[PDB]
Amino acid sequence: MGSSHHHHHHSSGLVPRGSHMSVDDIIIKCQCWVQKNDEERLAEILSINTRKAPPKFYVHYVNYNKRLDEWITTDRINLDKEVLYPKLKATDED
């Protein structure tokens, strides 16, 4: 087994350079679980946009208002579970 060894802060990175999960496993009217930092929510996929990088998808909540129904990226939408990847340390200065 393993232990919690992925507790880093001030992490950088915009586009997911080669992620474990992809949109290939995402269809229309599909259920997508939203994993919050310290919370847990659920949303649905209505549409999918492949113009930006990474691509964005249209999220929609059930039994809720429309104000919540908006479009977001994959950074907030996880296919299955959080993907753990290797990372190195960098030096900075003022």
From Swiss-Prot:
Q: Which species does this protein come from?
A: Saccharomyces cerevisiae (strain ATCC 204508 / S288c)
Q: What is this protein called?
A: Histone acetyltransferase ESA1
Instruction: Give residues where Phosphoserine occurs.
Output: S22
Identify its protein family: Belongs to the MYST (SAS/MOZ) family.
Misc remark for this entry?
Present with 1170 molecules/cell in log phase SD medium.
Q: Where is the Tudor-knot domain?
A: 27-79
> How does the entry describe the domains?
The ESA1-RPD3 motif is common to ESA1 and RPD3 and is required for ESA1 histone acetyl-transferase (HAT) activity and RPD3 histone deacetylase (HDAC) activity.
Q: What does this protein do?
A: Catalytic component of the NuA4 histone acetyltransferase (HAT), a multiprotein complex involved in epigenetic transcriptional activation of selected genes principally by acetylation of nucleosomal histones H4, H3, H2B, H2A and H2A variant H2A.Z. Acetylates histone H4 to form H4K5ac, H4K8ac, H4K12ac and H4K16ac, histone H3 to form H3K14ac, histone H2B to form H2BK16ac, histone H2A to form H2AK4ac and H2AK7ac, and histone variant H2A.Z to form H2A.ZK14ac. Acetylation of histones gives a specific tag for epigenetic transcription initiation and elongation.
Designated gene of the protein: ESA1
* Complex and partners: Component of the NuA4 histone acetyltransferase complex composed of at least ACT1, ARP4, EAF3, EAF5, EAF6, EAF7, EPL1, ESA1, SWC4, TRA1, VID21, YAF9 and YNG2. The complex interacts with histones H4 (HHF1 and HHF2), H3 (HHT1 and HHT2) and H2A (HTA1 and HTA2).
Q: Which domain of life is it from?
A: Eukaryota
